């Protein structure tokens, strides 16, 4: 219908935002950017709804316009800037670094990270073509163009990225038995090594995952984000380490912790 | 369907950008191009041995098979270079807890690398809009004729 849509009705907004039903009628529509709409956390939601640092939306603009807040290094002054998985939100005041990395319920958790882990990010390479003048390039789930990468690097591999400068300092091949973060589906936020991948020529390679609790499950290869080695990840994982416990399991953990 | 003539049109039939240099004396006249459509569909030898042109051929032409792969039994071969198959199936009506016979006819392009007749079961592959109605291309005959030569004369 006639052109780009500019609004987002509350209720149409993604759920893992934990937006609330009333108090309005719209939600912030994520700017065009590095991450898809429906898999992002816009700056307004994070500064206000998570960190509680502003109350008003109007205050969130006042905060950003001082250039306090910088994503992946750069300063970012877009109330609805589409922040998303693997990024690094930083508050110059309050000396505070974060990474956007998933819960186990499938939500973006607040996750405080070190001042120096904050100087690089991970990126799944999504494609690698041969660009203009013979110069080969890789492109990462967060839309970064990196020229002259390792030949050995190909699609579905993850890649450590300088932030400080553009470049790739390391990569991890997609091999049977590599630490995997699950970015999508119901199994979103789970973490678990890899068993083996169903091929299926024509569409939708499946990837069989097993975590550190010898529980198993499957997703589409598309939904698989390599992040390291058995034991050894390459970023600090948020508490609970994406293991996913039964409702009964979680009930008990929560009603075992009680002796005030 | 095609058969005979090959150069039978007002325009000259040729595979595009497949130059044969008249200067260079060759023993085959026409240099031919082909591919394997993929998904494990044997590009039959009649498409390589052939001389027909059909740009809408999955092995010799500039179509591409991607998407749905379907089977059905041939019910109409009256159209030049395209057939019509019937895909039958049973459709489940919950209230009665029973199914009824239904069917659909899908029209599909058939390259003169195949020789199809009515009753042949045929595996077709989805391709780009190739005509007003045809969105599929015959990609393998899982048939033969249904024992025709076992209908010859007397002893």
């Amino acid at each position: 219908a006639r052109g780009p849509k500019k609004h987002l009705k509350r209720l149409a907004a993604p759920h893992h935002w934990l937006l609330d039903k009333l108090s309005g009628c719209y939600a912030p529509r994520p700017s065009a950017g590095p991450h898809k709409l429906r898999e992002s956390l816009p700056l307004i939601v994070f500064l206000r709804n998570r960190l509680k640092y502003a109350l008003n939306g109007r205050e969130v603009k006042a905060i950003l316009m001082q250039r306090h807040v910088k994503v992946d290094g750069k300063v970012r002054t877009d109330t609805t800037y589409p922040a998303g998985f693997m990024d690094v939100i930083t508050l110059d005041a309050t000396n505070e670094n974060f990474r956007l990395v998933y819960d186990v319920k499938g939500r973006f958790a607040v996750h405080r990270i070190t001042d120096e882990e904050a100087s690089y990010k991970l990126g799944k390479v999504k494609k690698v073509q041969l660009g203009k003048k013979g110069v080969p390039y890789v492109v990462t789930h967060d839309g970064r163009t990196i020229r002259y990468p390792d030949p050995n690097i190909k699609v579905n591999d993850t890649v450590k990225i300088d932030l400080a400068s553009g470049k790739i300092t390391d990569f991890i091949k997609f091999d049977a038995g590599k630490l995997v973060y699950v970015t999508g589906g119901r199994n979103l936020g789970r973490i678990g090594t890899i068993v083996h991948k169903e091929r299926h020529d024509g569409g939708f390679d499946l990837v069989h995952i097993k975590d550190s609790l010898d529980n198993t499950f499957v997703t589409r290869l598309n939904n698989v984000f390599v992040i390291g080695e058995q034991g050894k990840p390459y970023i600090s994982l948020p508490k609970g380490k994406g293991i996913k416990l039964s409702i009964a399991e979680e009930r008990d953990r929560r009603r075992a912790q009680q002796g005030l | 369907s095609t058969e005979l003539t090959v150069q039978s049109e007002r325009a000259f039939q040729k595979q595009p950008h497949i130059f044969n240099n008249p200067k260079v004396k060759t023993s085959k006249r026409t240099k031919r191009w082909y591919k394997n459509a993929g998904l494990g569909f044997k590009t039959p030898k009649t498409a390589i041995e052939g001389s027909y042109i059909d740009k809408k051929c999955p092995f010799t032409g500039l179509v591409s098979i991607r998407g749905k792969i379907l089977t059905g039994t041939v019910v109409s071969t009256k159209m030049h270079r395209t057939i019509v198959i019937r895909r039958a199936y049973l459709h489940y009506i919950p209230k009665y807890n029973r199914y009824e016979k239904r069917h659909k006819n899908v029209p599909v392009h058939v390259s003169p690398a195949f020789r199809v007749q009515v009753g042949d079961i045929v595996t077709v592959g989805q391709c780009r809009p190739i005509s007003k109605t045809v969105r599929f291309n015959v990609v393998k005959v899982s048939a033969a004729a249904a024992k025709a030569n076992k209908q010859f004369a007397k002893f």
Partner: protein
């Protein structure tokens, strides 16, 4: 204006479809360039999203290439002489792709003789080297050599003049030339 929807047009059953919605501009079609010969006259046309298309109406020169010699020259376009789609294109000398034309030869002459040192139909140092280097290669082809006497070469337009403002093509050669030669006279 011209629509390219399928939503007119009976369904494959033959059924008559109601009108749902009006003409959108993204299914639009525009009119034919119907380009002719002579004195450069092209009109840009603003097509979806910026993107110019060039509508040639009247062209006199195009860039034509002799494939087997791997060169390309810019010649006059003499005339249209055969067209598989519609004869009115031939009779009104209309340029479109597929059209069979005649061009000039004298640029493809001036190249040949200056490169082979042989001349069609009927003293420098390095030249003699290069000329003698070539040949056993200068053999051309009868049905193409003949045309030079006439000073006009048969060629098949390969560009889309109504689209790109270019009227380009290749010389006719060997197999495909024989095809039109037969059609030419066995219709003449």
């Amino acid at each position: 204006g011209i629509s390219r929807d399928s939503r007119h047009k009976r369904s494959a059953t033959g059924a008559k479809r109601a009108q749902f919605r009006k003409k959108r501009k993204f299914e639009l079609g525009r009119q034919p360039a119907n380009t002719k010969i002579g004195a450069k006259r092209i009109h840009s046309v603003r097509t979806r999203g910026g993107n110019k298309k060039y509508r040639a109406l009247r062209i006199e020169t195009g860039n034509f290439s002799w494939a087997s010699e791997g060169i390309s020259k810019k010649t006059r376009i003499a005339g249209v002489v055969y067209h598989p789609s519609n004869n009115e294109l031939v009779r009104t000398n209309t340029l479109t792709k597929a059209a069979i034309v005649q061009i000039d030869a004298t640029p493809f002459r001036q190249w040949f003789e200056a490169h082979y040192g042989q001349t069609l139909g009927k003293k420098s140092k390095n030249a003699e080297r290069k000329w003698a280097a070539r040949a056993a290669s200068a053999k051309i082809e009868s049905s193409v050599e003949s045309q030079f006497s006439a000073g006009r070469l048969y060629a098949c337009i390969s560009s889309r003049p109504g689209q790109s403002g270019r009227c380009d093509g290749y010389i006719l050669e060997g197999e495909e030339l024989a095809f039109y030669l037969r059609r030419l006279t066995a219709k003449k």
